[PDB]
Amino acid sequence: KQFTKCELSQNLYDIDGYGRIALPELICTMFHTSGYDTQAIVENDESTEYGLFQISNALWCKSSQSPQSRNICDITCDKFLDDDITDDIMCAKKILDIKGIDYWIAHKALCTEKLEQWLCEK
Ligand SMILES: [Ca+2]
Numbered sequence: 001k002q003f004t005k006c007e008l009s010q011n012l013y014d015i016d017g018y019g020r021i022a023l024p025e026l027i028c029t030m031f032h033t034s035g036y037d038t039q040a041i042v043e044n045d046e047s048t049e050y051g052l053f054q055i056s057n058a059l060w061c062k063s064s065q066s067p068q069s070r071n072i073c074d075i076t077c078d079k080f081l082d083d084d085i086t087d088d089i090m091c092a093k094k095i096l097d098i099k100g101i102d103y104w105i106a107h108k109a110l111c112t113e114k115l116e117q118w119l120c121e122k
Helices: 005-011 023-034 077-081 086-098 105-110
Strands: 041-043 048-050
Touching: 005 023, 023 105, 048 077, 077 086
Parallel strands: none
Antiparallel strands: 041 048
């Protein structure tokens, strides 16, 4: 499932100021990250990143591809490919708590200027 900008900001409302992050900032980031597609799958070196949040199996979830993964979010990477982004969000919170938003390269890159384009309400 692909989200529209507003449908997502909607579902992620209670994330604003979460860890001193700005919603628009985070929306901007997801856009460049997966284009808001829940089924986004990206193979990197050996490893892969999954879902809207493109959370890596090198460290965050468990995949047969990287048995040695620390599986910090303690979940199978397959859970990041369904139409329920709840679990995804819990993993995302975990990343934010431990790593920070710089886990996502698009942040520093393009989402710290004109986050205007990233607001919705109507
Ligand atoms: Ca999910």
